Design an enzyme around this catalytic site. Structure first.
Site, PDB file in Angstrom:
ATOM      1  N   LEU A 228      49.497  24.634  81.744  1.00  0.00           N
ATOM      2  CA  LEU A 228      48.595  25.769  81.974  1.00  0.00           C
ATOM      3  C   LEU A 228      48.857  26.482  83.314  1.00  0.00           C
ATOM      4  O   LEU A 228      48.520  27.659  83.461  1.00  0.00           O
ATOM      5  CB  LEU A 228      47.121  25.343  81.840  1.00  0.00           C
ATOM      6  CG  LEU A 228      46.453  24.475  82.917  1.00  0.00           C
ATOM      7  CD1 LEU A 228      46.064  25.298  84.152  1.00  0.00           C
ATOM      8  CD2 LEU A 228      45.221  23.767  82.328  1.00  0.00           C
ATOM      9  N   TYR A 229      49.470  25.769  84.264  1.00  0.00           N
ATOM     10  CA  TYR A 229      49.734  26.294  85.593  1.00  0.00           C
ATOM     11  C   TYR A 229      51.064  27.047  85.723  1.00  0.00           C
ATOM     12  O   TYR A 229      51.489  27.395  86.835  1.00  0.00           O
ATOM     13  CB  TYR A 229      49.698  25.168  86.615  1.00  0.00           C
ATOM     14  CG  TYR A 229      48.735  25.420  87.739  1.00  0.00           C
ATOM     15  CD1 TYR A 229      47.551  24.685  87.838  1.00  0.00           C
ATOM     16  CD2 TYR A 229      48.995  26.399  88.698  1.00  0.00           C
ATOM     17  CE1 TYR A 229      46.649  24.910  88.883  1.00  0.00           C
ATOM     18  CE2 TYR A 229      48.111  26.640  89.733  1.00  0.00           C
ATOM     19  CZ  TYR A 229      46.936  25.891  89.823  1.00  0.00           C
ATOM     20  OH  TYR A 229      46.063  26.133  90.858  1.00  0.00           O
TER      21      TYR A 229
ATOM     22  N   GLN B  58      52.200  28.260  94.154  1.00  0.00           N
ATOM     23  CA  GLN B  58      53.486  27.627  93.880  1.00  0.00           C
ATOM     24  C   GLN B  58      53.715  26.441  94.821  1.00  0.00           C
ATOM     25  O   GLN B  58      53.959  25.328  94.365  1.00  0.00           O
ATOM     26  CB  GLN B  58      54.628  28.629  93.984  1.00  0.00           C
ATOM     27  CG  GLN B  58      55.912  28.138  93.311  1.00  0.00           C
ATOM     28  CD  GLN B  58      57.114  29.041  93.542  1.00  0.00           C
ATOM     29  OE1 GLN B  58      57.046  30.043  94.264  1.00  0.00           O
ATOM     30  NE2 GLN B  58      58.237  28.682  92.923  1.00  0.00           N
TER      31      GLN B  58
ATOM     32  N   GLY C 141      41.471  24.382  83.256  1.00  0.00           N
ATOM     33  CA  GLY C 141      41.927  24.304  84.639  1.00  0.00           C
ATOM     34  C   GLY C 141      40.929  23.716  85.622  1.00  0.00           C
ATOM     35  O   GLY C 141      41.315  22.939  86.505  1.00  0.00           O
TER      36      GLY C 141
ATOM     37  N   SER D 289      41.422  20.466  88.123  1.00  0.00           N
ATOM     38  CA  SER D 289      41.380  20.776  89.546  1.00  0.00           C
ATOM     39  C   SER D 289      40.402  19.905  90.334  1.00  0.00           C
ATOM     40  O   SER D 289      40.771  19.404  91.395  1.00  0.00           O
ATOM     41  CB  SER D 289      41.077  22.262  89.768  1.00  0.00           C
ATOM     42  OG  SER D 289      42.089  23.038  89.151  1.00  0.00           O
TER      43      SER D 289
ATOM     44  N   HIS E 154      53.459  22.402  93.514  1.00  0.00           N
ATOM     45  CA  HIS E 154      54.761  21.734  93.389  1.00  0.00           C
ATOM     46  C   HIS E 154      54.847  20.395  94.116  1.00  0.00           C
ATOM     47  O   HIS E 154      55.897  19.771  94.123  1.00  0.00           O
ATOM     48  CB  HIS E 154      55.915  22.642  93.812  1.00  0.00           C
ATOM     49  CG  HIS E 154      56.357  23.583  92.735  1.00  0.00           C
ATOM     50  ND1 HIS E 154      57.595  23.959  92.333  1.00  0.00           N
ATOM     51  CD2 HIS E 154      55.465  24.270  91.930  1.00  0.00           C
ATOM     52  CE1 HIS E 154      57.429  24.852  91.299  1.00  0.00           C
ATOM     53  NE2 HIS E 154      56.136  25.014  91.069  1.00  0.00           N
TER      54      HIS E 154
ATOM     55  N   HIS F 190      53.766  32.362  85.752  1.00  0.00           N
ATOM     56  CA  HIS F 190      54.864  33.276  86.075  1.00  0.00           C
ATOM     57  C   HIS F 190      54.534  34.790  86.018  1.00  0.00           C
ATOM     58  O   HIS F 190      55.193  35.573  86.705  1.00  0.00           O
ATOM     59  CB  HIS F 190      56.120  32.910  85.284  1.00  0.00           C
ATOM     60  CG  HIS F 190      56.635  31.545  85.619  1.00  0.00           C
ATOM     61  ND1 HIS F 190      56.562  30.485  84.740  1.00  0.00           N
ATOM     62  CD2 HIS F 190      57.178  31.052  86.761  1.00  0.00           C
ATOM     63  CE1 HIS F 190      57.060  29.405  85.316  1.00  0.00           C
ATOM     64  NE2 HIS F 190      57.440  29.721  86.541  1.00  0.00           N
TER      65      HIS F 190
HETATM   66  C1  COH Z   1      51.757  28.503  90.161  1.00  0.00           C
HETATM   67  C2  COH Z   1      52.401  29.672  90.120  1.00  0.00           C
HETATM   68  C3  COH Z   1      53.948  29.747  90.122  1.00  0.00           C
HETATM   69  C4  COH Z   1      54.678  30.692  90.748  1.00  0.00           C
HETATM   70  C5  COH Z   1      54.104  31.865  91.586  1.00  0.00           C
HETATM   71  C6  COH Z   1      56.094  30.420  90.514  1.00  0.00           C
HETATM   72  C7  COH Z   1      57.195  31.144  90.988  1.00  0.00           C
HETATM   73  C8  COH Z   1      58.534  31.027  90.586  1.00  0.00           C
HETATM   74  C9  COH Z   1      59.721  31.759  91.062  1.00  0.00           C
HETATM   75  C10 COH Z   1      59.826  32.870  92.136  1.00  0.00           C
HETATM   76  C11 COH Z   1      59.154  32.822  93.288  1.00  0.00           C
HETATM   77  C12 COH Z   1      60.785  31.323  90.381  1.00  0.00           C
HETATM   78  C13 COH Z   1      62.240  31.824  90.548  1.00  0.00           C
HETATM   79  C14 COH Z   1      60.344  30.304  89.451  1.00  0.00           C
HETATM   80  C15 COH Z   1      61.149  29.606  88.571  1.00  0.00           C
HETATM   81  C16 COH Z   1      60.850  28.390  87.998  1.00  0.00           C
HETATM   82  N1  COH Z   1      59.595  27.805  87.957  1.00  0.00           N
HETATM   83 CO1  COH Z   1      57.812  28.545  88.768  1.00  0.00          CO
HETATM   84  N2  COH Z   1      56.147  29.280  89.718  1.00  0.00           N
HETATM   85  C17 COH Z   1      54.862  28.831  89.453  1.00  0.00           C
HETATM   86  C18 COH Z   1      54.530  27.718  88.692  1.00  0.00           C
HETATM   87  C19 COH Z   1      55.382  26.766  88.153  1.00  0.00           C
HETATM   88  C20 COH Z   1      55.032  25.420  87.716  1.00  0.00           C
HETATM   89  C21 COH Z   1      53.652  24.727  87.744  1.00  0.00           C
HETATM   90  C22 COH Z   1      56.339  24.798  87.210  1.00  0.00           C
HETATM   91  C23 COH Z   1      56.537  23.375  86.643  1.00  0.00           C
HETATM   92  C24 COH Z   1      57.069  22.464  87.751  1.00  0.00           C
HETATM   93  C25 COH Z   1      57.634  21.189  87.164  1.00  0.00           C
HETATM   94  O1  COH Z   1      57.195  20.790  86.049  1.00  0.00           O
HETATM   95  O2  COH Z   1      58.525  20.566  87.797  1.00  0.00           O
HETATM   96  C26 COH Z   1      57.347  25.820  87.387  1.00  0.00           C
HETATM   97  C27 COH Z   1      58.679  25.698  87.049  1.00  0.00           C
HETATM   98  C28 COH Z   1      59.705  26.594  87.295  1.00  0.00           C
HETATM   99  C29 COH Z   1      61.098  26.427  86.912  1.00  0.00           C
HETATM  100  C30 COH Z   1      61.664  25.203  86.161  1.00  0.00           C
HETATM  101  C31 COH Z   1      61.392  23.949  86.991  1.00  0.00           C
HETATM  102  C32 COH Z   1      62.640  23.116  87.095  1.00  0.00           C
HETATM  103  O3  COH Z   1      63.251  22.842  86.020  1.00  0.00           O
HETATM  104  O4  COH Z   1      63.018  22.732  88.241  1.00  0.00           O
HETATM  105  C33 COH Z   1      61.786  27.501  87.334  1.00  0.00           C
HETATM  106  C34 COH Z   1      63.302  27.767  87.155  1.00  0.00           C
HETATM  107  N3  COH Z   1      56.745  26.946  87.938  1.00  0.00           N
HETATM  108  N4  COH Z   1      58.974  30.148  89.606  1.00  0.00           N
HETATM  109  C1  LIG Z   2      44.070  23.733  92.028  1.00  0.00           C
HETATM  110  C2  LIG Z   2      43.790  24.364  90.682  1.00  0.00           C
HETATM  111  C3  LIG Z   2      42.900  25.605  90.756  1.00  0.00           C
HETATM  112  C4  LIG Z   2      43.117  26.528  89.560  1.00  0.00           C
HETATM  113  C5  LIG Z   2      42.998  25.797  88.219  1.00  0.00           C
HETATM  114  C6  LIG Z   2      43.298  26.689  87.029  1.00  0.00           C
HETATM  115  C7  LIG Z   2      42.526  27.684  86.575  1.00  0.00           C
HETATM  116  C8  LIG Z   2      41.210  28.136  87.181  1.00  0.00           C
HETATM  117  C9  LIG Z   2      40.355  26.948  87.564  1.00  0.00           C
HETATM  118  C10 LIG Z   2      39.403  27.022  88.488  1.00  0.00           C
HETATM  119  C11 LIG Z   2      39.080  28.309  89.208  1.00  0.00           C
HETATM  120  C12 LIG Z   2      37.866  28.968  88.590  1.00  0.00           C
HETATM  121  C13 LIG Z   2      36.683  28.375  88.389  1.00  0.00           C
HETATM  122  C14 LIG Z   2      36.382  26.935  88.740  1.00  0.00           C
HETATM  123  C15 LIG Z   2      35.219  26.862  89.702  1.00  0.00           C
HETATM  124  C16 LIG Z   2      34.469  25.769  89.857  1.00  0.00           C
HETATM  125  C17 LIG Z   2      34.689  24.481  89.089  1.00  0.00           C
HETATM  126  C18 LIG Z   2      35.751  23.609  89.760  1.00  0.00           C
HETATM  127  C19 LIG Z   2      35.391  23.255  91.201  1.00  0.00           C
HETATM  128  C20 LIG Z   2      36.504  22.462  91.842  1.00  0.00           C
HETATM  129  O1  LIG Z   2      37.648  22.524  91.337  1.00  0.00           O
HETATM  130  O2  LIG Z   2      36.238  21.775  92.858  1.00  0.00           O
END
Ligand code: COH
Ligand SMILES: CCCCC/C=C\C/C=C\C/C=C\C/C=C\CCCC(=O)O
Ligand code: COH
Ligand SMILES: *[C@@H]1O[C@H](CO)[C@@H](O[C@@H]2O[C@H](CO)[C@@H](O[C@H]3O[C@H](CO)[C@@H](O)[C@H](O)[C@@H]3O)[C@H](O)[C@H]2NC(C)=O)[C@H](O)[C@H]1NC(C)=O
Ligand SMILES: *[C@@H]1O[C@@H](CO)[C@@H](O[C@@H]2O[C@H](CO)[C@@H](O)[C@H](O)[C@H]2NC(C)=O)[C@H](O)[C@H]1NC(C)=O
Ligand SMILES: *[C@@H]1O[C@H](CO)[C@@H](O[C@@H]2O[C@H](CO)[C@@H](O)[C@H](O)[C@H]2NC(C)=O)[C@H](O)[C@H]1NC(C)=O
Ligand SMILES: *[C@@H]1O[C@H](CO)[C@@H](O[C@H]2O[C@H](CO)[C@@H](O)[C@H](O)[C@H]2NC(C)=O)[C@H](O)[C@H]1NC(C)=O
Ligand SMILES: CCCCC/C=C\C/C=C\C/C=C\C/C=C\CCCC(=O)O
Ligand SMILES: CCCCCCCCO[C@@H]1O[C@H](CO)[C@@H](O)[C@H](O)[C@H]1O
Ligand SMILES: *[C@@H]1O[C@H](CO)[C@@H](O)[C@H](O)[C@H]1NC(C)=O
Ligand SMILES: *[C@@H]1O[C@H](CO)[C@@H](O)[C@H](O)[C@H]1NC(C)=O
Lengths: 551, 552
Positions: free
Chosen positions: A353-354, A172, A495, A499, A176, A357
């Site tokens: 894709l990221y 997260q 992904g 990445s 972000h 949640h």
């Molecule tokens: C990567 C994993 C991950 C996690 C663990 C996580 C953890 C949590 C969490 C509790 C800890 C809460 C309450 C939320 C709640 C939200 N998340 Co995420 N989020 C995650 C990935 C994302 C991503 C990527 C976006 C889009 C961000 C953007 O487009 O601004 C997002 C967007 C959001 C939004 C809308 C964005 C906005 O309009 O500002 C809310 C609300 N959320 N999330």
């Molecule tokens: C920061 C984003 C990381 C997660 C992206 C989303 C899903 C999974 C993607 C990658 C993790 C699994 C396998 C990829 C491994 C090697 C290729 C990329 C090497 C790199 O990337 O150098």
């Protein structure tokens, strides 16, 4: 309607209208020719016969531990295989970038305007008879129905790969900095104009915000000391805008680079860690260079932390995710005799894709306490009460949820998951199977093939009718996972190349930057090349608690 | 003072302080090692033996006309030679970019902030005992003395390569899309945030400006008709801000992409031609695509025009400048199997070297008239009175000035030349000899060697004392020119790699852009691949008068 609505051009051939109801495919450099770019050139037949599938490659990388054990301890060989790992993905991302939400053909506007997310696939044209082009019903299924039937968590499904809360909050926090949607403009727009790992989430997006966060002594960031512990400074002290509810006490209004980070104590934990790391690196460089001023100390430390971040993301974060026995390596040198573009533009689909949640637990378990979402949100007093050491110990031990495999989005964030579907539609995303084709994957022939399962597949068939109109985002969360893995094929294959670009397509990885002098000498350079998630915590958290991304 | 003030690190080694009194050189990938990166590795010795000098290669390229004639007619050999011309220049330019006026060390601020011009050499540090570092006197000579003694025109010196006013104004028009100094911020800052060939000088730098210039029908740009001729629209009509003196009547306040183009009728000439060309390409595209809307028509025409511009610059403009018998070629495909970064940042030194003011004549000769600078400036009536046909005919015939060789800056622009010197100092430019080494050239060992002559060298000797503190900009204008050439060695060796990056680094030259479909199909692609300065004039100027960049 637009004659390219059916997406007739295959193998990354480009479609262009030639009259009101005629199209032409541009098959330039695809390796195919003919009307739809479907007849392979001789060399392309040979390439295709020999190319192993992603699933085969995955299997090889997740087995034969004895072999990889040898490979990992022979530096020349480890380098050779990492070099291959980097360059195999390379051809899949348009760089310089191409399409965006408003441009389904290349234009100077789409190239030059940094406020847009770029697009891996052009949007479905506005006048297409069907949401996905020409296939499926007049409208897609109700997004609430999709959400409730196949996305919402019934019982918590733990990640079989053992991802923990340290991992979930790092994902997260890290993402972000480059996924920062500009909601006043719309979902296809970003506020992260750097389009990557610039650490704006620590230092601020603008120069004005950065200057308010800086101490202007010894290159350092401003901070406060509460109960003998270093935390970020206040909104009142810095005059830095942050998002907080009206009820939050003055000293708990922490000011950091990213304005939303006060929302989650998990995010403030990493914000505090990275702030301390910046100031730690300042202390080191001041020791190395008593002649340097505040500005050079600040800028050099920032470059070093960008390096640490990339190092940690490859060798710990991605390493954990991959499940590979092969040890991934951060080494910019591996690309120096290869064709590679040192630049990146963040794709909308990479953001989509990221949206992981399902990682989120039902409660947040720190020390003896088990906090609900309602207790945890916007509550930094939890961080102060327990302290950073206990956070690390608790979150290292707490398991995260499985992402693929279906039905694991906690209901507390149901509105976020529905928004992901609604906004995908609003941005006119092509179907799952189009994205699969775009990334050299075989289209799914049924819903049961997608899920590897019967019940969710049946609900999806009744909702979508045709597998070729299944949407990308819900598919990633219902997809049949790899064996005992957190993700299915589509998540990893999309992904991974996104990445690689965001990590290696940083200027600090280019030959003119990747030098000791860039980082204040050999001492600075070594901070990057030895960085790990363990050392980040060991250096900056009292008691040096053990940590990792796995339980 | 800063330990790196003396520029001790050689061969592109990087200097950093390691204490108040000490420095360390980073010799990574230079091919040299040692305290100052001066001890060559064995392979570097072998490379430094078989490496011809720039003057040698220039000689080969400007002689054996009969051999080049054959080579030019063997498409395989021409592609091979052109591929080499492209790649030999490549390694000389930092891309991604590094330094700027405020950062003598790499920083995220210097990388990310597009408002800066980048720097091919970092600025001399603020506390250095001497303007150039450690060498020379406490103060540089009075820039007025330098200007008057060796730069100002006595009598006009025509360019021996036959450059005309079509060339001079093309140079000014083309370059002022990416040289756009931000005077409110300072000489090291730019308003051209696109950092290259984006044609903002036709379409405007911002979206708001672009929209005010656009017709929103058929992809076209707004225009007006005066006596049956198409000209750019007015400021009143578009609400587009332009720089004009107060005395200019509303009807003569032409509105174009670049704020400053209304100030020289030679600039307005090219502004009008390119506006017409855009609308011509819109008509062709509409014929090919009756299904297309205004937005796609406008965007695709812009991409075609960008392609045309690069094409003409390489195959007409650089071809002419070069004096080469070999026919240069615009072909992005030549780089597809090579390492190359499709991106560009405009360097301050590229801006400085391009101050080609000696090109300007004493008077502007159109038809029967000889206009002074006072008469010519801000006076678009001259354009309306004579028309484009006569502008083209007259400017094709009128010779431009020699840039190198000394004493050819017109008196009318003396303040501009002095500004170039003064702003270089303000931006803390390193010396001419530092820039020569940066671009793999031998440092000059005397002022006589620099000029090829005796009288100006003596003036410069008495002004500067030491050849190692001679400044870059005035050196470019006094330098011994190549035989019968407009420029000396330093101009070309610095100018060529910068030009390669701004032309070939453009995204349209990248594999995913360089396709027929990017440009609306084969017909659009062909407009780019057959463009020339002559075809641009022929298609857009009544009577299709003959034109080129030389007098002949
Ligand atoms: C990567 C994993 C991950 C996690 C663990 C996580 C953890 C949590 C969490 C509790 C800890 C809460 C309450 C939320 C709640 C939200 N998340 Co995420 N989020 C995650 C990935 C994302 C991503 C990527 C976006 C889009 C961000 C953007 O487009 O601004 C997002 C967007 C959001 C939004 C809308 C964005 C906005 O309009 O500002 C809310 C609300 N959320 N999330
Ligand atoms: C920061 C984003 C990381 C997660 C992206 C989303 C899903 C999974 C993607 C990658 C993790 C699994 C396998 C990829 C491994 C090697 C290729 C990329 C090497 C790199 O990337 O150098
Ligand atoms: C390339 C050839 C070229 C030509 C033919 C040309 C022809 C003419 C011309 C024709 C009648 C006039 C009146 C001027 C007058 C000026 N030029 Co030029 N200029 C040229 C290249 C440049 C460049 C490059 C700059 C710097 C532009 C910037 O940085 O904004 C410039 C700057 C200027 C400035 C601002 C100088 C300062 O104080 O910084 C003036 C005034 N001039 N020039
Ligand atoms: C990058 O693309 C953005 C989307 O096109 C663009 O935002 C848009 O900008 C236009 C014109 O600047 C705004 O239009 C506004 O201004 C005009 C001019 O007076 C008015 O006619 C309109 O009513 C309106 O007020 C759009 O509102 C705006 N769209 C948004 C915010 O989504 C950016 O300008 C582009 N960025 C750059 C640097 O070019
Ligand atoms: C490192 O490069 C230079 C540093 O500029 C050189 O130092 C100079 O040597 C000169 C002649 O040999 C002397 O004039 C003077 O002693 C010295 N200059 C200064 C400012 O100290 C070093 O000799 C060289 N070292 C090596 C190993 O070649
Ligand atoms: C790029 O750098 C310039 C110069 O530092 C920035 O302009 C300054 O911004 C500060 C802080 O907001 C202002 O106080 C000054 O007015 C500016 N100084 C000038 C004009 O020389 C500019 O903001 C930077 N651009 C970005 C996008 O950060
Ligand atoms: C290229 O694709 C077009 C459009 O998809 C093909 O047109 C046909 O596709 C199938 C061919 O057997 C038919 O079942 C479809 O009914 C028909 N669709 C349309 C819209 O005409 C076309 O055959 C393809 N061309 C080639 C050379 O394979
Ligand atoms: C942007 C155009 C600038 C013109 C060049 C400026 C100064 C002199 C430099 C080059 C003109 C003379 C010779 C060119 C020779 C080789 C360059 C070819 C590479 C390229 O450039 O393709
Ligand atoms: C938090 C989960 C609440 C979902 C409420 C909507 C239920 C409609 O969804 C149904 O849920 C059943 C229970 O899992 C499944 O067996 C069915 O396949 C599914 O269609
Ligand atoms: C915030 O956390 C504290 C524990 O640190 C807890 O007692 C309190 O209930 C929480 N506040 C809210 C409003 O939930
Ligand atoms: C402007 O140009 C006209 C020629 O059309 C000329 O007669 C007049 O004198 C010029 N104006 C000035 C200010 O000299």
């Amino acid at each position: 309607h637009h004659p390219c609505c059916s997406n007739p051009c295959q193998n990354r051939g480009e479609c262009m209208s030639t009259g009101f109801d005629q199209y032409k495919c541009d098959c330039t450099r695809t390796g195919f020719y003919g009307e739809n770019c479907t007849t392979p050139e001789f060399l392309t037949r040979i390439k295709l016969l020999l190319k192993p599938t992603p699933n085969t490659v995955h299997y090889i990388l997740t087995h034969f531990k004895g072999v990889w054990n040898i490979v990992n301890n022979i530096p020349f060989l480890r380098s050779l295989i990492m070099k291959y790992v980097l360059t195999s993905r390379s051809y899949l991302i348009d760089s310089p970038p191409t399409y965006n939400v408003h441009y389904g053909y290349k234009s100077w506007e789409a190239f030059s305007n940094l406020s847009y997310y770029t697009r891996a696939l052009p949007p479905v044209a506005d006048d297409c008879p069907t949401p996905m082009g020409v296939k499926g019903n007049k409208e897609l299924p109700d997004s609430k129905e999709v959400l409730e039937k196949v996305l919402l968590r019934r019982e918590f499904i733990p990640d079989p790969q053992g991802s923990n809360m340290m991992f979930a909050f790092f994902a997260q926090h890290f993402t972000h900095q480059f996924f920062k949607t500009d909601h006043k403009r719309g979902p296809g727009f970003t506020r992260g104009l750097g389009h990557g790992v610039d650490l704006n989430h620590i230092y601020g997006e603008t120069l004005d915000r950065q200057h308010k966060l800086r101490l202007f002594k010894d290159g350092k960031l401003k901070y406060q000391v509460i109960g003998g512990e270093v935390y970020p400074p206040t909104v009142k002290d810095t005059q830095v805008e942050m998002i907080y509810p009206p009820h939050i006490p003055e000293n708990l209004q922490f000011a950091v680079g990213q304005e939303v980070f006060g929302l989650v104590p998990g995010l403030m934990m990493y914000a505090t860690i990275w702030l301390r790391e910046h100031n730690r690196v300042c202390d080191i460089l001041k020791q190395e260079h008593p002649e340097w001023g505040d500005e050079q100390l600040f800028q050099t430390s920032r470059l070093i932390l960008i390096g640490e971040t990339i190092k940690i993301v490859i060798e710990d974060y991605v390493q954990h995710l991959s499940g590979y026995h092969f040890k991934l390596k951060f080494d910019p040198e591996l690309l120096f005799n290869q064709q590679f573009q040192y630049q990146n533009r963040i794709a909308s689909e990479f953001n989509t894709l990221y949206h992981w949640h399902p990682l989120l637990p039902d409660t947040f378990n720190i020390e003896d306490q088990e906090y609900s979402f309602k207790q945890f949100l916007y509550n930094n007093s939890i961080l102060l009460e327990h302290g950073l050491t206990q956070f690390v110990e608790s979150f290292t031990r707490q398991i995260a949820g499985r992402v693929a495999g279906g039905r694991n989005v906690p209901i507390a964030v149901q509105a976020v998951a529905k928004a992901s579907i609604d906004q995908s539609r609003e941005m006119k995303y092509q179907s799952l199977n189009e994205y699969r084709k775009r990334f050299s994957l075989k289209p799914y022939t049924s819903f049961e093939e997608l899920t590897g399962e019967k019940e969710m597949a049946a609900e999806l068939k009744a909702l979508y009718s045709d597998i070729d109109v299944m949407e990308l985002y819900p598919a990633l969360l219902v997809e049949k996972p790899r064996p005992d893995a957190i993700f299915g094929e589509t998540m990893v294959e999309l992904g991974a190349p996104f990445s690689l670009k965001v990590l290696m397509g940083n200027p600090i990885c280019s030959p003119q930057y990747w030098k000791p002098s860039t980082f204040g000498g050999e001492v600075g350079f070594k901070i990057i090349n030895t960085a790990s998630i363990q050392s980040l915590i060991c250096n900056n958290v009292k008691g040096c608690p053990f940590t990792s991304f796995n339980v």
